Design a protein around this nucleic acid. Structure first.
Ligand SMILES: [Mg+2]
Ligand SMILES: [Zn+2]
Ligand SMILES: [Zn+2]
Lengths: 49, 270, 137, 30, 147, 181, 116, 56, 65, 391
RNA sequence: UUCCAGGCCU
C-alpha cells in the first residue's frame, strides 16, 4: 500500500521511448529508488520515490 | 545378563523426554520406529467444532483449527474406538468425547480463553481421556483466544481417535532426535570443509559414549550401525514412555497384519 | 572349463590419489620380463597401497577349478579362488600394440581402468570381457 | 561534550526524527 | 517466494517421517532446490539464512540492513558460538531409511511470503459451453466458463 | 547534513553533534527537539536536484573524514576520504531505496536486477494491510493466519511499519535436492 | 480442491487386499508383492530384515510415486524355498526383535526416577 | 487475425504446471478435476459397448 | 494475531508458553534469547515461533462489537 | 508457441491435485518453468485426429529437432547434477542399495550384475549400475582433452553394448548434446526406446541422489583466504595500471591508435585492464575451490552456473556499463555528488571491486543498478521486436 | 456484452 502511495507515472512519446527515459540516471540518486520499477512495458517509465 | 537382541539403555528421563541409547539393531528398524512414533501412534484431539456464537476477532475456523491442536488426554484411548469403525450413526461415548466452551467479556479488561476451560460433557466412561493436557505454570495451558467487553464465544467440540497420517493434531510425537556413529567410522557423510574437517564441524555430545577414531587403524569396510542416540519428547496426551512403547507396539502390530494377510490369503481358493 | 590366464608379481613405482578420496591409480614393473609394466586404479579404502610392494597379479575368467545372475554370499563354503585379497572384475576394451610385439591390453572394471604390457599374454589373454583381477600381500 | 562528532549509528535517530514529523506520505499530503 | 526474486510453486508436500532430519529433531518446512542459486547469484538469500539461524538462537533481531558492518565471517563466528556448523550446514538423515546424507545441507530459517495466486483459483477446464453472440465462438475468461 | 568547516578546533564537520543527537533521543524518549529544528538550526538542508549539481557529499558521515593509523579482511572495500571540499553528507545510503527495496535483506549482495523482482512480488504477496479488515467491505483481500515478523530486517522497516504488519513467516528452509520435486 | 482424502493413506477402500503377489517372470523363483495403503515405515524394514535370510537371492522395494501410499516388494529365493515363507520369517523376526526391545525398554524404564 | 487465424476453443484446459520425476517423458499428469470436465465423443461399438455402458 | 498453538516445524506445544514469555521480559526482565531458553524452547524450530509472533489480536480487540 | 515442439502430444495419466504434472526432460522444449507458470492443453475429438497427434505429435518423436539436427530434450538439473556424482570412479555402492536401484529400472532383466569389487566387500560403481539403463548396441566415444583410452581425469566418454566403460557422465554425454548418448539412442534404437530411457536414467539417478544428497550455501561462495587477498591486489595492481596510463594521457603522450580519439583510444585501454583483471581475479578462486565445493559441482555437471557466476560471487563483480560506455558524467563531469569533477578513475566510472559475498558500496550499488536497468530495458523490447520478427 | 485502466507470466 505504501509503495503505491509514493509512485510515479511518466508519459511517453507514443511507443516505447527506448533510450533517454527508461534508463536509470545519475540525477536519480537519492530521489528515486534504483531497483524498484515494473518489468517490461512501462519499465523505467514508472518510478518509485 | 538377559534379553535377545535390541537393547536400550535409558541415558536420562523426564516427564517430557526420554534420552535413551537404543543399541544393537538395524538402522532401518531404529528409523521405522522413529517414524511410527511420529505419525501413527493413536491419539485424541478435537476434530469437530460447532460454533453457536462467536464475537471474537478470530473467525470461526481460525479457532476451530487451534482447538484441534489443543493437546487432549489419551492415556487410554485404546478403549475408545475410531468413530469410523463404531456403529453409532455419527458418534457416541463409544467412539468420541464431547467438550463445551463458553466465554464472555465480564472483565472489561481482556478476558482470556484457555484450554483449561473446555468442559467434558459426554460420559468419560471412566478413563483418562479428553482432559486438556496442561503443562502450564498457573494451570491454564494453551491460550485459545481473547475477547473484549461483550465478546461471546459458544462452542461444542467433539474429539475422536485419529493419527498423524490424517493430521498432525494426532501427533503424540512433538520431535524426535536421531544420530549414530558420532565419529563417522562408516563415512555416511563427507564433511564439507574449507580447511580442517575436525575444526569447522562441531563434535557431538555423543562422541563420548563411543571410542574416538585412532589414526593408525585403516578403514572398517565391514562397519555397520548399532547404538542410536534418540530423544523422544512428547506433548502430553501420551506419557513420554508410551510414545515409545506404543511406538514399539503400533509398528509391531502392522508388521504382523502382514502375516495376518499371508494367512487369510492362503485359506482362499476353491 | 576354468583355468588361470596370467600370473606375476610387481613393485609399486608409485601410487596416485589425484582428486580422489578412495581411489588411486597406481603402476609397477615386472619381476620377470622387464618389459611387463602395469597400470591400475584401486579402491585404496579396501586395499591400501604404498610405494614398492610385491602384489601377485593373477587373472582368469572363472570360479575355482570347477554370464547369469550374481548369487550373494553362501559361497562362504563354495569354491574360493579368492586366495587373494583384491578381486575386481570388469572388461577389456582395447588391445593396443606398443610396437615391437610389446602389446598392451586395457581392462576396466565398471569404472576403474587398467593396462598391461609385454607379450607373453599370448594364448592366455583372451579378448573376452570377463576377467576377474586379483592381488595379494 | 554536547558537541562531539557523530558516529554512523547516530544518523538513524535523525531519520527517525524525519518521519516523526514528515511521514511516509509527506509528499501526497502537503 | 523469498525476498530475492526467488519465485516458486509447491511440487509436492510431505510430513516429518518423510522429510529429511537433523539429529536435533528439527526438519524443514520448505525445501528449495540448490540450482536456483548459482545462476541468480542471490547470495543475500544465503546470508539472510545464516543471519536468521543466529538471531533465531540468540533472539536478537538479525540486522540485514543495506550497507553495514556485518560479514559472513562476522556471523559464522557467532553461529559457531551456538554449536552448529560455522557456515550453517548440518548433517541430516534420509527420512525414509534414517541413513545419513553423504552431503550436508544449508539448513536455516528464511523469511518467505505466500503470494496470492493459488492453483485452485486458476485450474480451468472447458469442454464446450457458453458461446459469444457476434462471433459464436467460446467466451473469454474462466470466470465465465469460456474456453 | 550540512558539513561546513565551521570548526575552529579541527577541520570540516557535521553542523550537528553527539549532543544534537541525545537532544533528539530526548524527545524520542517521552514521545521538544523536532526535525524541523534540525532544519532551522541550519544543521541540514533540502538539497534540490539542480542545486545538488554544485556540492560534494561524504558517503558515510564519519569514516570519510579523519586521517590514518590494515583494514578488516572480512569487510568489503570502500574508496578513500578524498578531498575536504565536502559541503554536505549522506544521512545513510540506505535511503536511495524506496519502500519495496528497503525490505530486501542485504540488497547489496544480489545480482542488480534480482532486487527489482522482490520490488514487485512483495506487492503481490499477502499480509495484514491494516488491522481493521474486520470492518472493511473491500471487494476482496487476504490475511495470513499467523503472520510472523521477519528475523533478518532493515533499520528501514522500522519506519515502514513492518515488524508490526509483516507479509510472511520465517520457515526453516532446507536447501537441497530430495525427491526431485 | 483436487486434494485426495487424508485417510486414503491407510484405509483400503472397496476391496484392496493389503498384500497382492504377482510372480516376477523376468527371473526364476522371485515375486512382487504389492503393499496397499502402506509405505517406507513398513517397507524399508521388511526389506532390511528380509535381506538377512541367507536363502534370499534378491530383495528390494519401491514406492511407485509419492502421491500413492503403496510399494512393491520384490523377493527372489534359493529355489525350493518359497519366498513367501522368507517374508513370513523376516516378518516374525521383526516382531520378535520388537518384543524383546519393548521389554528391555520397559525394563530400563521401570528402573528410573526424575523430577519434571 | 483474431477470429479465423486463431479462435477460442472447446475441449481445452489450463492450470499451473509442476514438474514430476516419476512420469514417463511423454505423459502428463492431469488433475481429476479436469479429467471429469473434458470429454471425448466415443462411438458405441460392440468392442466397447461393455466398458462404455459401465462409464455411462 | 494470537499465539500459535504448537510449533509448525516440530509441533512442541507453544500456545501456553506465551504469557510466561512476555512476563520473563517486562517483569522478570530477561533478554529474549534466554527468556525463550527459560520456557523450554530449545532448538530454533520452536524458538523462531515465539520470538517472531506478532500478537496483533490486541490491536484487533481494541475496536467494538 | 514459437517452436514446432512447443506443443507435443502426451499420454493422459489422470492424477490428483490441481496441477499439470509433466515430465522434466520435456521442460526445455516448452520453455517451461514452475515459478507460477501455466500451460494449456486441448483434447482431440475424432479417432483420426488423435491418430494425428499420436502418430506425429508425440514427445518421443519431437525428441530430435531439425532446427538444429540434434535432440532438443535431455537430462537436466537433479538428474544431471546427480548423474555426474553417481558416475565418478571415487563413487561406489554396496549391495542393499544397488538391489533397490536395480529394481527401480522398470525393465531390468532382473539379473543383478557382477560387482566390479568382489574383493573384500562386494561393491558396485555409479557408472556400473547407471548402465543398467543404457540399452545395447549403444556405442559411444568422446575424448575431451587429456582423454586417452585410459583417460586419467575420467576425461571423455566410452560406452559399449550399453555399458559405461569409462569417464564421468554429464551435460556433454547425457545432455541435449549433438553426439549425445541421447541423440544416439534415439537414432540407433527408436523414438520409443530413447523416450523410455529418460525414465530409467531419471528414476535411477534421481533415486540415488535422494540419499547421497546435495545443496549450496554461502560456505560455497567464500574463496580460500589468501586466494582472495591475492586477488585484492590482482585488483589494485590494475588500478595503478590505470592510474599510470591515465596520467600518461593527462600529459598528452599517447598514440591515438588509428581511427580513435585520444579519448576513445584511452578508455579502451582502461576498460580492457579492469575486465582483464576481474576475470583472472575470478578464475583464481575458481580452480581454487576444491571439487567438494557445491557451486562448482553444478557448474561441472553443467546443470547450473558458470565461471562468470562464481567470479562475481566469490571474487569480483565487474565494471558496470551503459551502452558500452562505463557510467557516464551525466552529473557535470562526474558520476555522483560523491565525486570530485573530472574523475575518470574506475572507482567513479562504475567498477565494482567487491564481490557479492562482501557486498557493494552505495556507489558500487547505484552504478550496478544503472547497468542493470539496461538489461530489463531491452529485455522489454528485445522481446517485442523479436515476437514480431518471428511472425 | 461494450468501452477505458491496471496488473501478472524469475
Ligand atoms: Mg515463470
Ligand atoms: Zn461411536
Ligand atoms: Zn519446534
Amino acid at each position: 500500500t505504501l509503495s503505491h502511495l509514493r509512485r510515479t507515472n511518466t508519459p511517453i512519446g507514443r511507443d516505447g521511448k527506448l533510450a533517454k527515459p527508461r534508463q536509470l540516471h545519475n540525477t536519480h540518486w537519492g530521489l528515486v529508488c534504483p531497483a524498484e520499477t515494473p518489468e517490461g512495458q512501462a519499465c523505467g517509465l514508472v518510478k518509485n520515490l | 545378563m538377559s534379553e535377545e537382541g535390541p537393547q536400550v539403555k535409558i541415558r536420562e528421563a523426564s516427564k517430557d523426554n526420554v534420552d535413551f541409547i537404543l543399541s544393537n539393531v538395524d538402522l532401518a528398524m531404529a528409523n521405522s520406529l522413529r517414524r511410527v512414533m511420529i505419525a501413527e501412534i493413536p491419539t485424541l484431539a478435537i476434530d469437530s467444532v460447532e460454533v453457536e456464537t462467536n464475537t471474537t476477532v478470530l473467525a470461526d475456523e481460525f479457532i476451530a483449527h487451534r482447538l484441534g491442536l489443543i493437546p487432549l488426554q489419551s492415556m487410554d484411548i485404546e478403549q475408545l474406538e475410531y468413530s469410523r469403525d463404531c456403529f453409532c450413526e455419527d458418534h457416541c461415548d463409544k467412539c468420541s468425547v464431547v467438550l463445551t466452551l463458553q466465554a464472555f467479556g465480564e472483565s472489561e479488561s481482556t478476558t482470556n480463553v484457555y484450554s483449561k476451560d473446555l468442559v467434558i460433557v459426554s460420559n468419560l466412561m471412566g478413563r483418562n481421556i479428553g482432559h486438556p493436557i496442561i503443562q502450564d505454570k498457573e494451570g491454564n495451558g494453551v491460550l485459545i483466544c481473547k475477547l473484549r467487553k461483550g465478546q461471546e464465544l459458544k462452542l461444542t467440540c467433539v474429539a475422536k481417535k485419529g493419527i498423524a497420517k490424517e493430521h498432525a493434531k494426532w501427533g503424540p510425537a512433538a520431535a524426535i532426535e536421531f544420530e549414530y556413529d558420532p565419529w563417522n567410522k562408516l563415512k555416511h557423510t563427507d564433511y564439507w570443509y574449507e580447511q580442517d574437517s575436525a575444526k569447522e564441524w562441531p563434535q557431538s555430545k555423543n562422541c563420548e559414549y563411543e571410542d574416538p577414531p585412532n589414526e593408525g587403524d585403516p578403514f572398517d569396510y565391514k562397519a555397520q550401525a548399532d547404538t542410536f542416540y534418540m530423544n523422544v519428547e512428547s506433548v502430553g496426551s501420551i506419557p513420554v514412555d508410551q510414545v515409545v512403547v506404543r511406538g514399539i507396539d503400533t509398528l509391531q502390530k502392522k508388521v504382523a497384519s502382514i502375516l495376518l494377510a499371508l494367512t487369510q490369503m492362503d485359506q482362499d481358493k476353491v | 572349463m576354468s583355468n588361470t590366464l596370467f600370473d606375476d608379481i610387481f613393485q609399486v613405482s608409485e601410487v596416485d590419489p589425484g582428486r580422489y578420496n578412495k581411489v588411486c591409480r597406481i603402476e609397477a614393473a615386472s619381476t620377470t620380463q622387464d618389459q611387463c609394466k602395469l597400470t591400475l586404479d584401486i579402491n585404496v579404502e579396501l586395499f591400501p597401497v604404498a610405494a614398492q610392494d610385491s602384489l601377485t597379479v593373477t587373472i582368469a575368467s572363472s570360479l575355482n577349478l570347477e554370464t547369469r545372475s550374481w548369487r550373494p554370499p553362501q559361497a562362504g563354503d563354495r569354491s574360493l579362488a579368492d586366495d587373494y585379497d583384491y578381486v575386481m572384475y570388469g572388461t577389456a576394451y582395447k588391445f593396443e600394440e606398443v610396437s615391437k610385439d610389446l602389446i598392451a591390453v586395457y581392462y576396466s572394471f565398471g569404472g576403474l581402468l587398467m593396462r598391461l604390457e609385454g607379450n607373453y599374454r599370448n594364448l592366455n589373454n583372451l579378448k573376452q570381457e570377463n576377467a576377474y583381477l586379483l592381488i595379494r600381500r | 561534550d554536547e558537541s562531539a562528532p557523530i558516529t554512523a549509528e547516530d544518523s538513524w535517530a535523525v531519520i527517525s526524527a524525519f518521519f516523526r514529523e514528515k511521514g511516509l506520505v509527506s509528499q501526497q499530503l502537503d | 517466494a523469498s525476498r530475492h526474486g526467488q519465485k516458486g510453486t509447491i511440487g509436492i508436500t510431505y510430513r516429518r517421517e518423510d522429510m529429511p532430519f537433523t539429529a536435533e529433531g528439527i526438519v524443514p518446512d520448505l525445501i528449495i532446490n540448490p540450482h536456483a542459486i548459482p545462476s541468480r547469484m542471490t547470495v543475500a538469500h544465503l546470508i539472510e539464512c545464516l543471519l536468521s539461524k543466529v538471531a533465531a538462537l540468540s533472539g536478537n533481531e538479525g540486522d540485514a540492513s543495506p550497507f553495514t558492518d556485518i560479514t559472513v565471517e562476522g556471523i559464522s563466528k557467532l553461529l559457531r558460538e551456538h554449536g552448529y556448523q560455522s557456515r550453517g550446514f548440518e548433517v541430516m538423515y534420509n527420512g525414509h531409511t534414517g541413513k545419513k546424507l553423504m552431503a550436508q545441507i544449508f539448513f536455516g530459517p528464511t523469511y518467505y511470503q505466500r503470494l496470492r495466486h493459488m492453483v485452485d483459483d486458476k485450474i480451468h477446464a472447458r469442454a464446450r459451453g457458453p458461446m459469444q453472440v457476434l462471433t459464436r465462438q467460446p467466451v473469454e475468461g474462466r470466470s465465465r466458463d469460456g474456453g | 547534513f550540512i558539513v561546513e568547516d565551521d570548526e575552529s578546533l579541527g577541520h570540516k564537520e557535521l553542523k550537528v553533534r553527539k549532543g544534537h543527537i541525545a537532544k533528539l533521543m530526548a524527545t524520542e524518549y517521552q514521545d521538544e527537539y523536532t526535525w524541523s529544528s534540525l532544519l532551522n538550526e541550519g544543521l541540514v538542508e533540502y538539497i534540490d536536484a539542480e542545486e545538488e549539481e554544485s556540492i560534494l557529499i561524504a558517503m558515510q558521515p564519519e569514516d570519510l573524514e579523519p586521517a590514518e593509523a590494515d583494514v578488516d579482511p572480512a569487510k568489503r572495500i570502500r574508496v578513500s576520504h578524498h578531498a575536504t571540499t565536502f559541503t554536505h553528507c549522506e544521512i545513510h545510503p540506505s535511503m536511495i531505496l524506496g519502500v519495496a527495496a528497503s525490505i530486501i535483506p542485504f540488497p547489496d549482495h544480489n545480482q542488480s536486477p534480482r532486487n527489482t523482482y522482490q520490488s514487485a512480488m512483495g506487492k503481490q504477496a499477502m499480509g495484514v494491510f491494516l488491522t481493521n479488515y474486520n470492518v472493511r467491505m473491500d471487494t476482496m483481500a487476504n490475511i495470513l493466519y499467523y503472520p510472523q515478523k521477519p528475523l533478518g530486517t532493515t533499520r528501514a522497516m522500522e519506519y515502514l511499519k513492518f515488524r508490526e504488519l509483516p507479509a510472511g513467516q520465517n520457515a526453516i528452509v532446507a536447501i537441497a535436492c530430495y525427491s526431485g520435486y | 480442491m483436487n486434494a485426495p482424502d487424508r485417510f486414503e493413506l491407510f484405509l483400503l477402500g472397496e476391496g484392496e487386499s493389503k498384500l497382492k503377489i504377482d510372480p516376477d517372470t523376468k527371473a526364476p523363483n522371485a515375486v512382487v508383492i504389492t503393499f496397499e495403503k502402506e509405505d517406507h515405515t513398513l517397507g524399508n524394514l521388511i526389506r532390511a530384515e528380509l535381506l538377512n535370510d541367507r536363502k534370499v537371492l534378491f530383495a528390494a522395494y519401491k514406492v511407485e510415486h509419492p502421491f500413492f501410499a503403496r510399494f512393491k516388494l520384490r523377493i527372489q529365493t534359493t529355489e525350493g524355498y518359497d519366498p513367501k515363507d522368507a517374508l513370513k520369517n523376516a516378518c516374525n523376526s521383526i516382531i520378535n526383535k520388537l518384543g524383546a526391545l519393548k521389554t528391555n525398554f520397559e525394563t530400563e524404564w521401570n528402573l528410573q526416577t526424575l523430577a519434571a | 487475425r483474431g477470429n479465423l487465424m486463431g479462435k477460442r476453443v472447446d475441449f481445452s484446459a489450463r492450470t499451473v504446471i509442476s514438474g514430476d520425476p516419476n512420469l514417463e517423458l511423454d505423459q502428463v499428469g492431469v488433475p481429476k478435476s479436469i479429467a471429469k470436465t473434458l470429454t471425448y465423443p466415443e462411438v458405441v461399438t460392440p468392442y466397447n459397448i461393455d466398458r462404455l455402458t459401465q462409464l455411462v | 494475531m494470537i499465539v500459535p498453538v504448537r510449533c509448525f516445524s516440530c509441533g512442541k506445544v507453544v500456545g501456553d508458553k506465551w504469557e510466561s514469555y512476555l512476563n520473563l521480559l517486562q517483569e522478570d526482565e530477561l533478554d529474549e534469547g534466554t527468556a525463550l531458553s527459560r520456557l523450554g524452547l530449545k532448538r530454533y524450530c520452536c524458538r523462531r515461533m515465539i520470538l517472531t509472533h506478532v500478537d496483533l489480536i490486541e490491536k484487533f480487540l481494541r475496536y467494538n462489537p | 508457441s514459437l517452436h514446432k515442439m512447443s506443443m507435443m502430444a502426451h499420454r493422459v495419466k489422470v492424477i490428483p491435485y490441481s496441477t499439470f504434472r509433466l515430465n522434466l526432460s520435456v521442460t526445455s522444449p516448452y520453455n517451461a518453468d514452475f515459478d507460477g507458470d501455466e500451460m494449456n492443453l486441448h483434447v482431440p475429438q475424432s479417432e483420426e485426429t488423435r491418430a494425428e497427434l499420436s502418430q506425429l505429435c508425440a514427445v518421443p518423436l519431437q525428441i530430435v529437432s531439425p532446427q538444429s539436427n540434434k535432440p532438443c530434450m535431455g537430462i537436466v538439473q537433479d538428474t544431471l547434477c546427480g548423474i555426474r556424482k553417481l558416475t565418478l570412479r571415487d563413487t561406489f555402492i554396496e549391495l542393499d542399495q544397488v538391489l533397490n536401484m536395480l529394481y527401480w529400472v522398470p525393465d531390468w532383466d532382473g539379473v543383478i550384475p557382477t560387482p566390479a569389487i568382489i574383493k573384500p566387500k562386494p561393491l558396485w560403481s555409479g557408472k556400473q549400475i547407471l548402465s543398467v539403463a543404457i540399452p545395447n548396441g549403444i556405442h559411444l566415444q568422446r575424448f575431451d582433452e587429456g582423454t586417452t583410452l585410459l583417460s586419467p581425469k575420467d576425461n571423455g566418454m566410452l560406452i559399449i553394448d550399453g555399458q559405461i566403460i569409462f569417464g564421468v557422465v554429464e551435460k556433454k554425454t547425457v545432455g541435449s548434446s549433438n553426439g549425445g548418448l541421447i541423440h544416439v539412442v534415439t537414432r540407433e534404437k527408436g523414438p520409443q526406446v530413447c523416450a523410455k530411457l529418460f525414465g530409467n536414467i531419471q528414476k535411477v539417478v534421481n533415486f540415488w541422489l535422494l540419499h547421497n544428497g546435495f545443496s549450496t550455501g554461502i560456505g560455497d561462495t567464500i574463496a580460500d583466504g589468501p586466494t582472495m587477498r591475492e586477488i585484492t591486489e590482482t585488483i589494485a595492481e590494475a588500478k595503478k595500471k590505470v592510474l599510470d596510463v591515465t596520467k600518461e594521457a593527462q600529459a598528452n603522450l599517447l598514440t591515438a591508435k588509428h581511427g580513435m580519439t585520444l579519448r576513445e583510444s584511452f578508455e579502451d585501454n582502461v576498460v580492457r585492464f579492469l575486465n582483464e583483471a576481474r576475470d583472472k581475479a575470478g578464475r583464481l578462486a575458481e580452480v581454487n575451490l576444491k571439487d567438494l565445493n557445491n557451486v562448482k559441482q553444478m557448474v561441472m555437471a553443467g546443470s547450473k552456473g558458470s565461471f562468470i557466476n562464481i567470479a562475481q560471487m566469490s571474487a569480483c563483480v565487474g565494471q558496470q556499463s551503459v551502452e558500452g560506455k562505463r557510467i557516464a558524467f551525466g552529473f557535470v563531469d562526474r558520476t555522483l555528488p560523491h565525486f570530485s569533477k573530472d574523475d575518470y578513475s574506475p572507482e567513479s566510472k562504475g567498477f565494482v571491486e567487491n564481490s557479492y559475498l562482501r557486498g557493494l558500496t552505495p556507489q558500487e550499488f547505484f552504478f550496478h543498478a544503472m547497468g542493470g536497468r539496461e538489461g530489463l530495458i531491452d529485455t522489454a523490447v528485445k522481446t517485442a521486436e523479436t515476437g514480431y520478427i518471428q511472425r
